[PDB]
Symmetry: D2
Subunit: 324 residues, 4 copies
């Protein structure tokens, strides 16, 4: 623990200026309550939740008997649904996603950032349980109707649905038709997601850069007026570092990319190490662990105290809350 903390401190000390600025911005958004987390399949896989390539390859085994491009990801489930029946599709869905898995530490770190909302394409309930444990209530929206009757100000928006109503394929977006008619089938959910993106600070965690949903979001963001939105933060946790060409392309596309592999060296299959590196960097920056010089000490104290310069006297009891 102490060794890991010291190594994280050294990593922060040798961190690049752009990455430290990104960390500062994310921490400021968290302090302001305007931080939204967009969780992908990486966080779900961190809890060994069934991966989608597995589902697609069982579908392909049923279709052709021998067990995958990105287009295939949507075509194969569609071919199974059409050639086969919806009953077999739903049976596979239930047999595979009808499992109970723990909430890996990345869920805890995501919830510990105090995100205003947690958007996710994951049909699992890991994030819901994680927010239940922490005692903060998130109104879960996974169907069109759920949008209207939202109980709380904080949203847990599963943009692709989930299996709360049942392990049926009409509850989730998995096949090609679901994606083609998503705008027509999920008007309210899509509008809510876009509004949350526009009004909040979005951090993409668990997504590959070439993911379908990320590219769709960037396509939509292209339409927005220049400088009318804040560039979302993209936590990239792929094994190998990010190529400079891809990094520049996707940063010009509208992302501020924090590459986990570029901060901490780890084994090719040590995804949890990279997720933890990024999330722990953010959390410790939140937890004042990385402030060492007296200059940063004065800056932190001033940031906490200066607003109180407007008041004539501050109760000593209040000073406790002033310093959390």
């Amino acid at each position: 623990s102490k060794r890991y903390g010291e190594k994280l401190k050294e990593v922060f000390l040798m961190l690049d200026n752009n990455v430290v600025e990104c960390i500062k911005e994310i921490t400021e958004s968290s302090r302001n309550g305007k931080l939204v987390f967009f969780v992908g399949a990486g966080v779900s896989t961190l809890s060994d939740y069934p991966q989608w390539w597995r589902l697609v390859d069982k579908y392909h085994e049923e279709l052709y008997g021998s067990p995958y491009s990105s287009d295939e990801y949507l075509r194969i489930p569609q071919i199974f649904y059409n050639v086969k029946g919806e009953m077999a599709f739903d049976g596979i869905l239930k047999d595979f996603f009808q499992v109970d898995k723990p909430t890996n530490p990345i869920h805890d770190k995501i919830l510990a950032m105090n995100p205003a909302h947690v958007i996710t394409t994951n049909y699992d309930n890991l994030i819901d349980t994680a927010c239940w444990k922490r005692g903060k209530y998130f109104s879960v929206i996974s169907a069109e109707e759920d949008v209207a009757n939202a109980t709380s100000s904080r949203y847990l928006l599963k943009v692709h649905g989930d299996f709360r109503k049942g392990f049926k394929g009409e509850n989730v977006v998995l096949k090609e038709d679901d994606y083609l008619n998503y705008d027509q089938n999920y008007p309210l959910i899509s509008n809510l997601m876009k509004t949350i993106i526009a009004t909040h600070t979005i951090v993409f965690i668990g997504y590959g850069l070439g993911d379908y949903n990320i590219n769709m979001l960037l396509n939509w963001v292209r339409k927005l007026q220049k400088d009318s939105f804040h560039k979302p933060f993209f936590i990239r946790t792929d094994p190998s570092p990010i190529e400079n060409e891809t990094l520049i392309y996707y940063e010009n596309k509208g992302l501020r990319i924090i590459d986990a592999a570029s901060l901490i060296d780890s084994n090719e299959y040590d995804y949890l190490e990279r997720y933890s590196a990024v999330m722990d960097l953010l959390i410790e920056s939140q937890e004042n662990k990385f402030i060492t010089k007296d200059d940063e000490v004065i800056d932190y104290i001033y940031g906490k105290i200066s607003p109180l310069f407007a008041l004539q006297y501050i109760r000593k009891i209040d000073l406790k809350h002033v310093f959390e």
Copy 2:
């Protein structure tokens, strides 16, 4: 009043108490403060374009023709000289504010709602442009979907010409999405709008595409001089609107619009604290609504009960 009107009042007041009431204020409320109606601008454009002096499509066409012909400078100058006039804030603006709306969406370019919010001591983050959406300093929005003249009395800051309406979804994606989200997640009351209004019917067309029971029917405060024909009410209520008719609300003249608006506004406000229970069944229903959640607890302190009943 009629049972359906009382039900609309109850729903509106419950939403206002819960903080989930959004007010969609049209041009009628602004005109209530003598603000120049758009038809005045359209007639001025027609008089400048032709010898002298409008359909719904002409509303957008004549400004568009004047633009294309006489220049953005001329269009802008007409708008500036016609709109750069200070006006007072109506008692109906203050009634709307006193309803405690979560958000106030409006298709008005004036600051009358802005001035009323500033006077009433209500802090709303004003969203009149695309950049304002991300810069919203508060969680309650005063959303001018058609822009305004805060940046300047320019024709590019507001949606007046036909081209502006044609490319609205492309020029105001953030604002349009925000309006649709607020409509979906809130209780919407339309005031100052004609039932055949362009914006109202565009919103109804959008709602047509939603799921059958995935949204709450917006409340439409209709304040035209004559009572709504039963055929029109049937047509528009089947389209997702719950209409509170002011003409049916009270007897009034043909051109006393302030009284018609104030009837509905006051009837809503005074019902804010009204239990709306007269028979014993309603009283017992209200008491059960107050006391049933406490059935989970084994015992309730009597001194606590005062908070249960406010």
Copy 3:
């Protein structure tokens, strides 16, 4: 003027070259004593409320009547108002004689159909999705808004507000054919007003085309008064080359047939 004669010369060259298609509207059908649309709108309004129309009302009133009274009443009114033997007015004969490549008509009557049949000029009539795929002829008489060939019902026609709302979804093949014919031929807009809903929709579509990637359609404005200069320039920059019958000749308000006949026969002679 140079403009009028040059436009008519262009029309005649299109006719001679064989790339001429006529977009026939409501005025041409109204000439031969055919109920104007606002007459049916007034009929629906009277049935709805008992007393008597903007562009939006044109669609909404039939839509309101269909929604409340029902589809059966809508179809009954349509039948009793449109089932009638009517004569092919001289403008039909003139347009046919101009040897159009195709006839694209927003009118749901059979007038142009009967004119073609009895005049010897054969067109494959396309008024429904099934027509486009299986049409014997290569030259189409395209009724974009359908007609009553199958039956006097509102489902075969585009009248209500919802019919115009879902036209692209409901008439993909017909709309594609119309736009292709507009792109690949010379369009003469006869029987339409400048502020027409259909004309403005077509101009909206044209606005999205590549700059000077098409030939501006010819708009025959057979209206009572002369066209205002500002309106004329506005609609000429919208991709329309307008030939006005209120400036070509002089007549009174009700001489609509005279305006049509003049603006058509003069072009015919110029060829």
Copy 4:
């Protein structure tokens, strides 16, 4: 296959048969497959070398970072070649197509039509739609290099495909009209090709029986899987498989091309 060849022969005799020539036919003429040029782009970006997304993205990434000049330079060095027209070109033209629609941006089909004596008003840009001087059309729906080997004249990157309708309204309208008014036979197209699937997505919007189901000539080595065949025939494509039509070698594609084309021609 008998009914499909009967229908194709009927269309050819009547004159209402159109051919959709894909990249496969030009590849037959040793014209580089698209994935080869995608690998070329991927080599100058990351240094060392394919789904549809990457197909459209690698060119897009190179265009964005490297610039327009490098994109056009690679295009010029990659397409400044002359390739003989296959016997497949001649066989396809032997049916006297009403129109020929191809996504290939080469000039193989133009030269084949010239040599065989047929005349098609080749359309490859927007301004060519109005100026066409014939009812016969050769619709190059993805542009051409006739105006020069410039990136903006063709549709081969992600941005081009995304804004195709907004940039090719007339060409898209003409293609859809030709498909609706004719019977279409697809030749040299991947059964899972992006353009073919976009066409199928558009077709699923049309009302049932309002269009002739297009013929898809599949020339892959292995026979089309029964599940894939059933799915893509339900979608609206009548699939004729050359792999199952006659046994063939894996890398000998011309044999299946000729098998299908000559089985259609001899069926005349």
